[PDB]
Amino acid sequence: TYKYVNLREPSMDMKSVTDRAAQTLLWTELIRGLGMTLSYLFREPATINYPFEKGPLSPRFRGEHALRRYPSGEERCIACKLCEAVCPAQAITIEAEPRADGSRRTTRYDIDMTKCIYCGFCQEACPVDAIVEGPNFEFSTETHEELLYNKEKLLNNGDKWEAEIAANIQADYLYR
Amino acid sequence: LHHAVIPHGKGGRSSVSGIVATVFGATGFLGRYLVNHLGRMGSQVIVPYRCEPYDTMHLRPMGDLGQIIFMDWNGRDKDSIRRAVEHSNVVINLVGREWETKNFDFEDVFVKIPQAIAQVSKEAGVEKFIHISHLNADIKSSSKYLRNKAVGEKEVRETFPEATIIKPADIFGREDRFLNYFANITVKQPVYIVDVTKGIINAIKDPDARGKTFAFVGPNRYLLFDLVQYVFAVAHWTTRDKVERIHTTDRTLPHLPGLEDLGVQATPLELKAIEVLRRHRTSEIEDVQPA
Amino acid sequence: KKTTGLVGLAVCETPHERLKILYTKILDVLGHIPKNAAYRKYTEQITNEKLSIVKAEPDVKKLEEQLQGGQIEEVILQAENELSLARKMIQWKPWEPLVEEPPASQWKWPI
Amino acid sequence: HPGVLRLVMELSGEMVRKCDPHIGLLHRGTEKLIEYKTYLQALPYFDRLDYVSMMCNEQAYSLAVEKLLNIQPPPRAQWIRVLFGEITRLLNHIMAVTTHALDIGAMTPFFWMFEEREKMFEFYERVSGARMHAAYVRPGGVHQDLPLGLMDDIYEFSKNFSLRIDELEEMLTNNRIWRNRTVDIGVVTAEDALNYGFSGVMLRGSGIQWDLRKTQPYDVYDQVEFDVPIGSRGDCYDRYLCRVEEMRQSIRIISQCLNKMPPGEIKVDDAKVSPPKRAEMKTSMESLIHHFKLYTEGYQVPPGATYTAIEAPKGEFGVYLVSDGSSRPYRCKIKAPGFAHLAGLDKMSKGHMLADVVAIIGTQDIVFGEVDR
Amino acid sequence: TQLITVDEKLDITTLTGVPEEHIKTRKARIFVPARNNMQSGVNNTKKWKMEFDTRERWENPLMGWASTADPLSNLVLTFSTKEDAIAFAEKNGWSYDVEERKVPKPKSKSYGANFSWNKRTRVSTK
Amino acid sequence: TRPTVRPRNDVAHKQLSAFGEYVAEILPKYVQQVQVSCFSELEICIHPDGVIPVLTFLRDHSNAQFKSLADLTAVDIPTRQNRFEIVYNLLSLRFNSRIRVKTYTDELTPVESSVSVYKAANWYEREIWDMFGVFFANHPDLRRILTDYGFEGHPFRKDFPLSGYVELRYDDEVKRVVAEPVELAQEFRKFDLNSPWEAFPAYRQPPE
Amino acid sequence: TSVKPIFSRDMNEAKRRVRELYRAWYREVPNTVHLFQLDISVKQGRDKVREMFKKNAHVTDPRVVDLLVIKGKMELEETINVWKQRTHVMRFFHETEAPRPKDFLSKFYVGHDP
Amino acid sequence: GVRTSPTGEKVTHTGQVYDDEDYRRVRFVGRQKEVNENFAIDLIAEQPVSQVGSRVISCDGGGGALGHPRVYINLDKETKTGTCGYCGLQFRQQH
Amino acid sequence: ASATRLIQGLRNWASGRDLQAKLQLRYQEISKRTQPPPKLPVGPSHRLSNNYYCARDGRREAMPPSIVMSSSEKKAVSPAPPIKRWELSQDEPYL
Amino acid sequence: EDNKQFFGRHRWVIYTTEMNGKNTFWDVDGSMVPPEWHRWLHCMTDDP
Numbered sequence A: 001t002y003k004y005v006n007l008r009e010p011s012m013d014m015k016s017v018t019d020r021a022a023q024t025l026l027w028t029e030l031i032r033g034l035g036m037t038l039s040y041l042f043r044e045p046a047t048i049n050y051p052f053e054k055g056p057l058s059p060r061f062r063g064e065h066a067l068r069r070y071p072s073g074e075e076r077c078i079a080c081k082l083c084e085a086v087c088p089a090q091a092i093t094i095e096a097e098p099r100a101d102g103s104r105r106t107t108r109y110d111i112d113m114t115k116c117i118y119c120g121f122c123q124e125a126c127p128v129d130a131i132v133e134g135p136n137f138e139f140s141t142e143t144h145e146e147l148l149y150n151k152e153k154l155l156n157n158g159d160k161w162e163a164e165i166a167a168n169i170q171a172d173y174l175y176r
Numbered sequence B: 001l002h003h004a005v006i007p008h009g010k011g012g013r014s015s016v017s018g019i020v021a022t023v024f025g026a027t028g029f030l031g032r033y034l035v036n037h038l039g040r041m042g043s044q045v046i047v048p049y050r051c052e053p054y055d056t057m058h059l060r061p062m063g064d065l066g067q068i069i070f071m072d073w074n075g076r077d078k079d080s081i082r083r084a085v086e087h088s089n090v091v092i093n094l095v096g097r098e099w100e101t102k103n104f105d106f107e108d109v110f111v112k113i114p115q116a117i118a119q120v121s122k123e124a125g126v127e128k129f130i131h132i133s134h135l136n137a138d139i140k141s142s143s144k145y146l147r148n149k150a151v152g153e154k155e156v157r158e159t160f161p162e163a164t165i166i167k168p169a170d171i172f173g174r175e176d177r178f179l180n181y182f183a184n185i186t187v188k189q190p191v192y193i194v195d196v197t198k199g200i201i202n203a204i205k206d207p208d209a210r211g212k213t214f215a216f217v218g219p220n221r222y223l224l225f226d227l228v229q230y231v232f233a234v235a236h237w238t239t240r241d242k243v244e245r246i247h248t249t250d251r252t253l254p255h256l257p258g259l260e261d262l263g264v265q266a267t268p269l270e271l272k273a274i275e276v277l278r279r280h281r282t283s284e285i286e287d288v289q290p291a
Numbered sequence C: 001k002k003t004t005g006l007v008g009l010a011v012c013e014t015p016h017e018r019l020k021i022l023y024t025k026i027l028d029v030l031g032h033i034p035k036n037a038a039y040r041k042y043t044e045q046i047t048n049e050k051l052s053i054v055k056a057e058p059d060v061k062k063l064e065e066q067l068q069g070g071q072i073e074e075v076i077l078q079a080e081n082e083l084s085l086a087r088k089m090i091q092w093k094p095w096e097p098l099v100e101e102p103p104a105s106q107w108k109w110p111i
Numbered sequence D: 001h002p003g004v005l006r007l008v009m010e011l012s013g014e015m016v017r018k019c020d021p022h023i024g025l026l027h028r029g030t031e032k033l034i035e036y037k038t039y040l041q042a043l044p045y046f047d048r049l050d051y052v053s054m055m056c057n058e059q060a061y062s063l064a065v066e067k068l069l070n071i072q073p074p075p076r077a078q079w080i081r082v083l084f085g086e087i088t089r090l091l092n093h094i095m096a097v098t099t100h101a102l103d104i105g106a107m108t109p110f111f112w113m114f115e116e117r118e119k120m121f122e123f124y125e126r127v128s129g130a131r132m133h134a135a136y137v138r139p140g141g142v143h144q145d146l147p148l149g150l151m152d153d154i155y156e157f158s159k160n161f162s163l164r165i166d167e168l169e170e171m172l173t174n175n176r177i178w179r180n181r182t183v184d185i186g187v188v189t190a191e192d193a194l195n196y197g198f199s200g201v202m203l204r205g206s207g208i209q210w211d212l213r214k215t216q217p218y219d220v221y222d223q224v225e226f227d228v229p230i231g232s233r234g235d236c237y238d239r240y241l242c243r244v245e246e247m248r249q250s251i252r253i254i255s256q257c258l259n260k261m262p263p264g265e266i267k268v269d270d271a272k273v274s275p276p277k278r279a280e281m282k283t284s285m286e287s288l289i290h291h292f293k294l295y296t297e298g299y300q301v302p303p304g305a306t307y308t309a310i311e312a313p314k315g316e317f318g319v320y321l322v323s324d325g326s327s328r329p330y331r332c333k334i335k336a337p338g339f340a341h342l343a344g345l346d347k348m349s350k351g352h353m354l355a356d357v358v359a360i361i362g363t364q365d366i367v368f369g370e371v372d373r
Numbered sequence E: 001t002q003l004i005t006v007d008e009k010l011d012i013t014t015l016t017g018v019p020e021e022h023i024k025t026r027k028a029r030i031f032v033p034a035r036n037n038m039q040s041g042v043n044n045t046k047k048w049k050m051e052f053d054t055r056e057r058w059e060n061p062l063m064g065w066a067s068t069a070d071p072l073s074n075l076v077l078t079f080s081t082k083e084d085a086i087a088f089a090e091k092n093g094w095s096y097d098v099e100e101r102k103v104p105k106p107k108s109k110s111y112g113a114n115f116s117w118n119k120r121t122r123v124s125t126k
Numbered sequence F: 001t002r003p004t005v006r007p008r009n010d011v012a013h014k015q016l017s018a019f020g021e022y023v024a025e026i027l028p029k030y031v032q033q034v035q036v037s038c039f040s041e042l043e044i045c046i047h048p049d050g051v052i053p054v055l056t057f058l059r060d061h062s063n064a065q066f067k068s069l070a071d072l073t074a075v076d077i078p079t080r081q082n083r084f085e086i087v088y089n090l091l092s093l094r095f096n097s098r099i100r101v102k103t104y105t106d107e108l109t110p111v112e113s114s115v116s117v118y119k120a121a122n123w124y125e126r127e128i129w130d131m132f133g134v135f136f137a138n139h140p141d142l143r144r145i146l147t148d149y150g151f152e153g154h155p156f157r158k159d160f161p162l163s164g165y166v167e168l169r170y171d172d173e174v175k176r177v178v179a180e181p182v183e184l185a186q187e188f189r190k191f192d193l194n195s196p197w198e199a200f201p202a203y204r205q206p207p208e
Numbered sequence G: 001t002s003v004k005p006i007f008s009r010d011m012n013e014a015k016r017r018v019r020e021l022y023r024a025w026y027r028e029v030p031n032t033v034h035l036f037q038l039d040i041s042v043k044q045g046r047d048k049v050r051e052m053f054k055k056n057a058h059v060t061d062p063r064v065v066d067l068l069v070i071k072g073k074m075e076l077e078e079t080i081n082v083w084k085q086r087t088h089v090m091r092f093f094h095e096t097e098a099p100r101p102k103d104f105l106s107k108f109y110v111g112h113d114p
Numbered sequence H: 001g002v003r004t005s006p007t008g009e010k011v012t013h014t015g016q017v018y019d020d021e022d023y024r025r026v027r028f029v030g031r032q033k034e035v036n037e038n039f040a041i042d043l044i045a046e047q048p049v050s051q052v053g054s055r056v057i058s059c060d061g062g063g064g065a066l067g068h069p070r071v072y073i074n075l076d077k078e079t080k081t082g083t084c085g086y087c088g089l090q091f092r093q094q095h
Numbered sequence I: 001a002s003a004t005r006l007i008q009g010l011r012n013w014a015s016g017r018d019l020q021a022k023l024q025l026r027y028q029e030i031s032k033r034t035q036p037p038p039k040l041p042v043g044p045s046h047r048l049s050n051n052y053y054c055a056r057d058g059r060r061e062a063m064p065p066s067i068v069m070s071s072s073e074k075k076a077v078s079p080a081p082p083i084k085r086w087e088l089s090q091d092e093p094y095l
Numbered sequence J: 001e002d003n004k005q006f007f008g009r010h011r012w013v014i015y016t017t018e019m020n021g022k023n024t025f026w027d028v029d030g031s032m033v034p035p036e037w038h039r040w041l042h043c044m045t046d047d048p
């Protein structure tokens, strides 16, 4: 089925040609466009004041790159390197010593916020849900030094909130 | 010694060279091009600026990711200097203005500043303290600038005596003082900026050339008036204290070596003047060569 | 008919004799080529069956709905293109046997 | 700035002789980077070669891999994929119209329809969470299904947007001066439209009837009903109007897709292609092993070459896959309608002046992301 | 059709445009990759791969990354024979090292022969 | 074998089989292979001589129109004496069927200005020439598209690494943009994910 | 076996085409180096041009020399137009040291450079 | 909860702290070495050792399909008692 | 709402599509969040007692492509029968 | 939180001054907010 456009000519009836000539010589449909944009003048504007009203989001937004931990416990990461194995921009750098008490751990867990493309493949891939995208998007960094995160930056970033990520993981242990 | 002072691989742009240079001032001309040669070497420039963040912003991406570091300092205190040279390999002293101000003049900068920073550098354990001086700065008359730099040479020889006193000639480059002074309107040997700063970086990375003072020579050494002829042939703040400084003394000092003894090849005035002398509108190369 | 849909293709008023002279020239220029290839058999079969579909049909709409590859003058265009290949395929020797084989270790895929 | 391109025109004045569109300015090495990466880890490269078709490129890549891998995806996956395909088609046509307007002058309809585009970005936010690059279409059906409280919101949007697009045709569309600006220019002979490799909206405008959705239904497009508009002359006025009535047909397809939606299943039930769900992962063993080595090793793909294409709103967006029997794609290559349209720039603008040349660049949806490959 | 050429060596090395340091300084190595002997699976055999020699890797002094001045230190080329390996390696103009495809020993060991009467082939445990 | 499996439809397999046999009969001269894949698109493997007669035949002939041209890439593999593959792709507007005409070549043998028979092939030919170096003979105008001008090396080859050899920055000595040998900050940790045990036993090549 | 030749028949027309191409680069240098206003003498530019011709002198095939004729022809066309800017024309040189002499000992001090 | 270096500043959970012959102290001029103020090794012995009167027991991480996947651990020794590799918390059997 | 009657008549007059009804400033149409927790269906798997993977052996169906070549007749068929010419769509045709 | 205007103008913070030795009567920041109100304010939930 094809419903095509413009197979029609302006018919040569005298009223048709004088109405089209009145459109020409009297600018009528132009003034109709003026009336359209004035109808949008008198509307109420659809803006939001930013620094007092932040914009809406989802529970499934992808944010901040924090490390979590157990409920009053140890670091939920294990250094199992999956997040580097699926990180497409390869911004994850992991080096893993085992600690003193026999359990396996890290030395160095680094993200390049310059390099990260914010997919959450590490979110879909961390087998214990340690590294989780956060809610917020406010870095605005003055330096190119600060945008290379280390393990203590990520753990302090996880210290800056849990109850947010608690509500998000409670909203997303069902779909993902 | 401890690691990471060893260099690695090639040089420049995350090719780690083995020197850590604490450079004073350098928001002006010659310190900026020296920072550029150190970033081309791929080193760690510790620079204190005492200014607005905008000028050090315009020199900021010269070095690599985090190899530069910026910090405050001043010409009056000492704790900021010691906080600057906490962990330094080498340090070069380049500070000095051609005009007097309200709070700071030619005196007590060349008389105060190298004493204190040389003192705390000798305390905090640096090597290769390189202090600049003007060429032929003596106790000769009509030049407060030259006599203050001569007293500065005497003081740098005094405290931390194993210091590299250098004396480059009247430099010309991309942002020259006196050439641009000619743009808005007795032999003399000027020497181009990259010869000087290549000599500086070669003398800072080629040890056994340390403690012995070095002098730079312009490879023309002709009259001022023929140079005015050439610069207006190619080009179609005015205090006369400067004009006494540029008329007073122009001679050689054979008491010490120069360019080709250091490992650095000179470049004459003509080619570099073809480089920098733009602004014809919106070649007559004379070079009469007086001795 | 009135002002067909495609832009550069102006309308036609003589379908019949145009297609007849085009297909007779098809059969002649194919008559230059010997039957040493099966190409002559295939092209002769399709062209004569198409022309013999056209002959015993006088109509216009039935001539379009019966003769495939519509609508009307695109068939004429395509036939002119086939006569262009007929002229170009006197030359170039498509019927000749093969040019030399590859080194033959090639076309299995998984390298 | 008048995308970003080098234009080297040569002219008799207020007029023309001939030009050279130099592009390569936005070259990124995408094919080489895919030659070193795996399938899943390089799906975002297809998501952001073109950036407007944030789901149609996903659908084309996923059908390339599913066509190579012998997997028929489940029905609810197909319907969600078709729904997001029509939505992204709507967003792509509305960008083409509005950046044509902002190129021509014409300030205010850009901002009306970018309010609309902010709402549809908000629907992508609720679905994946990403603002724009919702990658989200894993090969083997769509992962992470749409949450509760969405479809009636799409229904509300559908009503209000049909009103807003009627109002947009009120604003533009038989205006005296926009017709006066662009009717005379850009005629394309349909025979030359076939031979110059023009595809998509160009074949809509010049004559000949063609649409991949009507010809080769690669998905559940056969079970929904619409009618594609055709242009009557080569005049880009017709091309513009064809884009508008394709938008209105996109609204019809979304209406029927909300009408006949089955509550079947998210993904395929083939754990050797897609990762398992998180509950069976954290409980049982084979799900964990498939999870772990599926993300690391990457699922093997049988060797062979394939080619596919969809009607992206530019045109026949094609991908050619070459796979050594491995976990990497060996070489992929992209048929870009933007590149093919950019080739015929001299033949669109051989006898017209430079402001209309910029109007001819604007009347075809170039982005110069996809035009680079 | 029986045109110009005579069989000479090939000179693509002037056509690739890489500088002379990487023309002549490095040396290739052509081998079948050994079976990853913590596993025993022989699918990763049967391809003649080309690699290059290595150079230094220093610490990134800011993050502790492996940074290097080595563009070609991420190469491997998978082949199916040795003649074409040598032909391509000299066709691009560099020296090279060829190794052996060391096949496993052909054995014939069996259960009853492990369970003999007098012989010392006696597993003593199963 | 029925649910969640993309079904074949062997009627189209038979129709394209008969068409391929038709093509092999009517052009006996330049045909080495006419293969049909199970997902039913035609592939025809071609000696690099009669490519222009093949295209002038398969643009026309009223039994198979194929006006529609698509991708061309000479997908580079080593291990063969002829490294490169010109992969023409064609679709008929009238017939809804996709054929691929793959002819072979090595690093010096050209094709002979195929732009004169498909007008879309102009920037495609110039693209393949710039990215690979596969010279195309008697073409009207060859230039460089999709590279830098000062760049050279034909980067889509396998010998060209993932990074390059030149790298730009801005130096303040001569106050311009200059190039350097490339100096990474991270390794690009290359992974060997070639795990054994033969996930596809249908394609087992024979040994010596 | 045999090869379809590209342009020439033996090494002689290859030498003739490259000769003519060098004539074209000779008449290309001074007008363009005035037009872009670089900082290099015409002697230095021409001598590094003929140095670049000295770089590939030992090539023994007609095909490769024809392909270099194509290379130099394309580069000469896009420099005789005003496309390739000051950056690329200066990028033909080396104003980034790289001073490294071929002394064994000077390469031995800062090492791992065989 | 940090120790103190021979330089005097804060060491981390890993003993990585610098020396006087370094210079990343001089890149720490005026900006904080952001140390973790809550070490994980110190937060293991603080937990109550659960003493389950079964033999071989499960471990999840406190919540179905959250935390780590299940692991079933043995409790046969009486001097080197139980420890999950994931949960990192001890177990005994006490009748 | 929050507008007087005169400008309400202006917004109805200056564009006759009744702005008061459908105005894209939604007030309480916005859905309540915190949905009750869902379950998820599984289609043609997890049904026990039969579900052999070799039955739905999807991947291993990759046959190699069948080849015809290296090196009276009711024939000369097209690759497909001719595609049917389309229809004037009854939902407002033209014309 | 209003229940009268449209969506996105439901909810708003109003910041105060001098909260970390800052004198922030002027120049208010993003993320001066505690995280539970950051959950509330983006309408990730309809509940305070």
Ligand SMILES: NC(=O)C1=CN([C@@H]2O[C@H](COP(=O)(O)OP(=O)(O)OC[C@H]3O[C@@H](n4cnc5c(N)ncnc54)[C@H](OP(=O)(O)O)[C@@H]3O)[C@@H](O)[C@H]2O)C=CC1
Pocket (backbone or CB within 6 Å): B025, B026, B027, B028, B029, B030, B031, B050, B051, B074, B075, B093, B094, B095, B096, B097, B098, B104, B109, B132, B133, B134, B168, B169, B170, B171
């Ligand atoms: N003929 C000549 O004058 C020649 C001079 N030189 C030397 O080059 C060096 C650099 O000078 P140049 O590049 O020409 O330009 P500048 O005069 O701008 O460099 C001097 C630097 O020291 C800073 N400075 C000056 N006075 C003070 C002060 N009282 N307190 C703190 N900082 C101060 C300057 O300003 P700020 O802090 O605002 O950045 C600037 O950064 C000088 O030491 C000069 O002796 C070398 C060759 C020739």
Ligand code: SF4
Pocket (backbone or CB within 6 Å): A076, A077, A078, A079, A080, A081, A082, A083, A084, A094, A125, A126, A127, A128, A129, A130, A131
């Ligand atoms: S995937 Fe998770 S547990 Fe594994 S290394 Fe990454 S953050 Fe750690």
Ligand code: SF4
Pocket (backbone or CB within 6 Å): A083, A086, A087, A088, A089, A090, A091, A092, A111, A115, A116, A117, A118, A119, A120, A121, A122, A123
């Ligand atoms: S979000 Fe993507 S790019 Fe970022 S760390 Fe995770 S996988 Fe890597």
Ligand SMILES: [Zn+2]
Pocket (backbone or CB within 6 Å): H059, H060, H061, H068, H071, H084, H085, H086, H087, H088
């Ligand atoms: Zn546990």
